[PDB]
Design a protein around this motif. Structure first.
Motif, PDB file in Angstrom:
ATOM      1  N   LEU A  81     -37.392  53.283  31.631  1.00  0.00           N
ATOM      2  CA  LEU A  81     -38.327  53.253  30.426  1.00  0.00           C
ATOM      3  C   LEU A  81     -37.662  53.686  29.351  1.00  0.00           C
ATOM      4  CD1 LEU A  81     -40.064  50.868  28.953  1.00  0.00           C
ATOM      5  CD2 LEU A  81     -41.701  52.699  29.987  1.00  0.00           C
ATOM      6  N   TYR A  82     -37.830  53.421  28.187  1.00  0.00           N
ATOM      7  CA  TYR A  82     -37.578  53.910  27.055  1.00  0.00           C
ATOM      8  C   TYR A  82     -38.490  54.070  25.763  1.00  0.00           C
ATOM      9  CZ  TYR A  82     -32.912  55.847  28.522  1.00  0.00           C
ATOM     10  OH  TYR A  82     -31.911  56.200  28.962  1.00  0.00           O
ATOM     11  N   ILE A  83     -39.495  54.385  25.228  1.00  0.00           N
ATOM     12  CA  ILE A  83     -40.113  54.340  24.501  1.00  0.00           C
ATOM     13  C   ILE A  83     -39.270  54.926  22.936  1.00  0.00           C
ATOM     14  CG2 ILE A  83     -42.453  54.051  23.269  1.00  0.00           C
ATOM     15  CD1 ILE A  83     -41.707  52.640  25.825  1.00  0.00           C
ATOM     16  N   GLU A  84     -38.859  53.841  22.458  1.00  0.00           N
ATOM     17  CA  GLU A  84     -38.225  54.365  20.914  1.00  0.00           C
ATOM     18  C   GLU A  84     -39.126  54.442  19.730  1.00  0.00           C
ATOM     19  OE1 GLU A  84     -34.696  51.882  19.273  1.00  0.00           O
ATOM     20  OE2 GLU A  84     -34.448  53.544  17.671  1.00  0.00           O
ATOM     21  N   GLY A  85     -39.409  55.829  18.939  1.00  0.00           N
ATOM     22  CA  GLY A  85     -40.533  55.716  17.739  1.00  0.00           C
ATOM     23  C   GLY A  85     -41.245  55.828  18.371  1.00  0.00           C
ATOM     24  N   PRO A  86     -42.261  56.457  18.974  1.00  0.00           N
ATOM     25  CA  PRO A  86     -43.474  56.825  19.658  1.00  0.00           C
ATOM     26  C   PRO A  86     -44.671  57.120  18.870  1.00  0.00           C
ATOM     27  CG  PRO A  86     -41.696  58.666  20.800  1.00  0.00           C
ATOM     28  CD  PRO A  86     -41.238  58.250  20.281  1.00  0.00           C
ATOM     29  N   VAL A  87     -43.926  58.408  17.645  1.00  0.00           N
ATOM     30  CA  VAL A  87     -44.875  58.527  16.782  1.00  0.00           C
ATOM     31  C   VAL A  87     -44.135  58.402  14.936  1.00  0.00           C
ATOM     32  CG1 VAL A  87     -46.395  60.414  18.330  1.00  0.00           C
ATOM     33  CG2 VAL A  87     -44.080  61.026  16.423  1.00  0.00           C
ATOM     34  N   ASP A  88     -44.644  58.983  14.188  1.00  0.00           N
ATOM     35  CA  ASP A  88     -43.683  58.653  12.756  1.00  0.00           C
ATOM     36  C   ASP A  88     -44.937  60.121  12.158  1.00  0.00           C
ATOM     37  OD1 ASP A  88     -42.620  58.611  10.285  1.00  0.00           O
ATOM     38  OD2 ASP A  88     -43.243  56.990  10.036  1.00  0.00           O
ATOM     39  N   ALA A  89     -44.326  61.349  12.344  1.00  0.00           N
ATOM     40  CA  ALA A  89     -44.628  62.724  11.319  1.00  0.00           C
ATOM     41  C   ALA A  89     -44.874  62.765   9.882  1.00  0.00           C
ATOM     42  CB  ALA A  89     -44.164  63.652  12.241  1.00  0.00           C
ATOM     43  N   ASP A 146     -39.483  49.825  20.913  1.00  0.00           N
ATOM     44  CA  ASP A 146     -39.503  50.464  20.114  1.00  0.00           C
ATOM     45  C   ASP A 146     -40.967  50.125  19.331  1.00  0.00           C
ATOM     46  OD1 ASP A 146     -39.823  51.505  17.145  1.00  0.00           O
ATOM     47  OD2 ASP A 146     -37.674  50.501  17.062  1.00  0.00           O
ATOM     48  N   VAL A 147     -42.030  50.594  19.205  1.00  0.00           N
ATOM     49  CA  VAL A 147     -43.358  51.204  18.756  1.00  0.00           C
ATOM     50  C   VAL A 147     -43.383  51.926  17.219  1.00  0.00           C
ATOM     51  CG1 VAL A 147     -44.438  51.236  21.147  1.00  0.00           C
ATOM     52  CG2 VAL A 147     -43.966  53.929  19.958  1.00  0.00           C
ATOM     53  N   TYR A 148     -42.860  51.772  16.991  1.00  0.00           N
ATOM     54  CA  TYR A 148     -42.874  51.867  15.762  1.00  0.00           C
ATOM     55  C   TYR A 148     -43.970  52.786  15.104  1.00  0.00           C
ATOM     56  CZ  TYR A 148     -39.564  48.441  14.773  1.00  0.00           C
ATOM     57  OH  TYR A 148     -38.320  47.959  14.877  1.00  0.00           O
ATOM     58  N   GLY A 149     -44.045  53.975  15.362  1.00  0.00           N
ATOM     59  CA  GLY A 149     -45.000  54.805  15.506  1.00  0.00           C
ATOM     60  C   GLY A 149     -46.588  54.635  15.944  1.00  0.00           C
ATOM     61  N   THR A 150     -46.867  53.389  16.452  1.00  0.00           N
ATOM     62  CA  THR A 150     -47.828  53.285  16.325  1.00  0.00           C
ATOM     63  C   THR A 150     -48.310  54.074  17.489  1.00  0.00           C
ATOM     64  OG1 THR A 150     -47.222  51.050  18.043  1.00  0.00           O
ATOM     65  CG2 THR A 150     -47.726  51.100  15.673  1.00  0.00           C
ATOM     66  N   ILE A 151     -48.129  55.043  18.192  1.00  0.00           N
ATOM     67  CA  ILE A 151     -48.120  55.919  20.046  1.00  0.00           C
ATOM     68  C   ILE A 151     -48.706  56.387  19.056  1.00  0.00           C
ATOM     69  CG2 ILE A 151     -48.070  56.902  22.054  1.00  0.00           C
ATOM     70  CD1 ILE A 151     -46.337  54.372  22.619  1.00  0.00           C
TER      71      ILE A 151
END
Lengths: 411, 411
Positions: B270-278, B238-243
């Motif tokens: 591989l799964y990436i959760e929350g790539p962006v937060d608009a 989970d990347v919390y929108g940081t990408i």
């Protein structure tokens, strides 16, 4: 009412089995993994995933009673039974124990608890973890069979008054001895923080200076962070025999040092667990007795807690009868059937010994929850927040079950 | 069968309530404590003890049904309901909900769940945490009233087969993203390790290079520490929108970067959760849809998981209908009544969306245990190991309840 069906299921407990001897020997580490070979019988690695076996007893009324077979982190150490792995025990339980459970009457608890506590298979008493889990499930069965809470069953069978009242709770930090203290202050923990002082050079200090500085840091932190001056917790630190190591196993020098820590607590009561480890039960009793004698001579208000070599019900009786220390850790899985915990706590209380109903980070949510009922009935002076090393989870499990149960009793 | 008495008791949940906007802004740190002062409407500190309210429903047959009202760590953020304090909610529950529970019929679950999910008090819906806890207790009540397991009640009321079969479990590390991985490998966790990649400079890297290195470290660690190649887990971070931050919300660039991580996973999915937060739901759906489109165009095997702005049952339906991503985190406390989890999982499964039955580290042993029953019935593709940040305790709670329950269903 009878048990209709008994089921055994493998699971994970809330910590790890650690080869304490190999770690004491100096095992290095790589991340969470200890390196080198283990030395304690049963261990195939220095650190192994903690395991349990859940016991479920489906009763004639459809209720399902539960208990967990679990063993302490440092299994196979200090006279304890070996580490406990499900692979071996599942077939053993299905073959040898299931037939002894199915059809068994559960209207009462004690006769069943005694039966399994003394049972021998191929000459050997059941592992303490098996007796621990079976007895939890049997207590829960008697409760569910009769519309009583587990606490009530204990009060009824031991003829105890059952007055609803909280038990002081003790949080353990593991090596996270700074951050965990903050957590414990935020959550108003009654007794804290254990601190895992298990190394001379880096945790206690060669002259006890590191521990001295830690106690000061600890009391300062509590006095600084607390939201009200009403928060006056007790300090309880486990030193894993390290004080004995730096003072030539001299009880008098040990007592002098322990007494000197009182000032660092700034008025908060102080308990030191496991000040020395004499390596066997008779010498341990004698050593603690001598430290206690000197603490008294000095007029110290600091108390000591027995742990190592005080495993079984009879061990607890022996430490108590000797007047060896102020408090004893009744390390619950090591007593086998939980009826032994009740008897141990009552024995301590009758004779003026403070009963610390402890346990391990390596047990389960069910074993901890069940222990809450034992404590509410028997009235120990202190109860360990368990299982786990995260602290938060154990507090959620122990504190909330305690308060839920008190509320039920009050109806 | 009716409820005779409803009790509400304050407790601690398994983590903390954190003031999200106070933090990412600039709140200082002192040990575990954040300094400065919150901005979020209900917080008295940037970080405060997590709280719950236990609901106990004593039925006419003497059984006691349980559920816990709990809320997420970052309450009051991302469209979620406010933090949840027992001081406020116990009087609220006694005043407004107790009169609606005492004497209530629990022969079925769904009507009661729907009633409390839509009930308005002074024009407002109940807090999601209240609906969450009440619904858990009401499911447990229906179960205990009828000699059924909670999972069976769900299967009966939704007409599902309840095939006794495990659900893949997902462990979260918190900031302990190296040590916790070792724990998870030792305990054979199906999906791991979350890694809390919530800071660009220290965790993701200004060009994503730190996360790239972490994925390689992670797959190398799994491949090195595992006992055999039979252990082949899925990676979920989970990347919390940081990408989105480092690529200035360019979905194509985000996809290129996400796709580039596949190499580092060494064959572990591989799964990436929350790539962006608009910052809002409509924009969030569009952004994830664009990232997914580009990942598909690239032929990437990496999947993305919606979280932020996907809170309620209807939100989940909207993200699903848009074909916006591969998986959605159904973050259980945020859906209110747990019947919404069942409906959400079924909707995902019917409409080509992977359902991740999530939750929070800041819930409880009871809420997690109840969630296991919901999952065994509804069949999400993944379930969060919870509560807490210690991991071990959550695994014990979730995995062991799951396996106990499967064993009971097989009887």
């Amino acid at each position: 009412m009878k048990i209709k069906q008994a089921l055994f299921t493998a699971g994970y407990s809330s910590f790890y089995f650690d080869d304490q001897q190999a770690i004491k020997n100096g095992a290095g580490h790589d991340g969470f993994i200890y390196t080198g070979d283990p030395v304690t019988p049963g261990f195939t690695s220095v650190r192994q995933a903690g395991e349990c076996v859940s016991v479920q007893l489906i009763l004639e009324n459809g209720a399902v009673a539960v208990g967990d077979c679990a063993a302490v982190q440092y299994s196979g150490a200090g006279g304890r039974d070996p580490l406990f792995l499900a692979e071996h025990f599942i077939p053993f339980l299905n073959d040898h124990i299931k037939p002894l459970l199915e059809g068994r009457d559960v209207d009462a608890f004690l006769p069943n608890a005694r039966f399994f506590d003394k049972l021998r298979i191929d000459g050997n008493l059941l592992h303490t973890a098996v007796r621990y889990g079976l007895s939890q499930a049997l207590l829960d069965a008697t409760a569910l069979a009769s519309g009583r809470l587990k606490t009530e069953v204990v009060c009824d069978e031991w003829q105890l008054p059952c007055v609803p009242e909280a038990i002081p709770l003790f949080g353990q930090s593991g090596d996270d001895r700074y951050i965990a203290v903050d957590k414990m202050i935020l959550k108003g923990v009654d007794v804290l923080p254990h601190a895992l002082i298990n190394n001379v050079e880096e945790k206690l200090g060669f002259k006890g200076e590191k521990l001295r500085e830690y106690v000061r840091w600890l009391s300062d932190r509590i006095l600084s962070l607390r939201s009200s001056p009403r928060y006056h917790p007790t300090l309880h630190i486990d030193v894993y025999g390290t004080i004995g190591l730096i003072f030539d196993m001299d009880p008098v020098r040990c007592a002098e040092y322990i007494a000197s820590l009182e000032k660092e607590a700034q008025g908060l009561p102080l308990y030191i667990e496991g000040p020395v480890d004499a390596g066997n039960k008779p010498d341990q009793i004698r050593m603690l007795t001598a430290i206690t004698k000197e603490l008294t001579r000095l007029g110290s208000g600091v108390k000591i807690v027995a742990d190592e070599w005080c495993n079984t019900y009879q061990d607890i009786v022996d430490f108590t009868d000797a007047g060896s220390c102020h408090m004893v850790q009744i390390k619950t899985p090591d007593l086998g059937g939980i009826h032994n915990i009740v008897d141990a706590v009552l024995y301590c209380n009758k004779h003026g010994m403070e009963a610390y109903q402890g346990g391990t980070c390596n047990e389960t949510e069910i074993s901890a929850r069940t222990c809450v009922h034992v404590a509410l009935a028997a009235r120990p002076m202190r109860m360990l927040i368990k299982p786990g090393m995260g602290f938060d989870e154990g507090l959620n499990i122990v504190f909330n079950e305690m308060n839920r149960t008190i509320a039920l009793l009050q109806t």
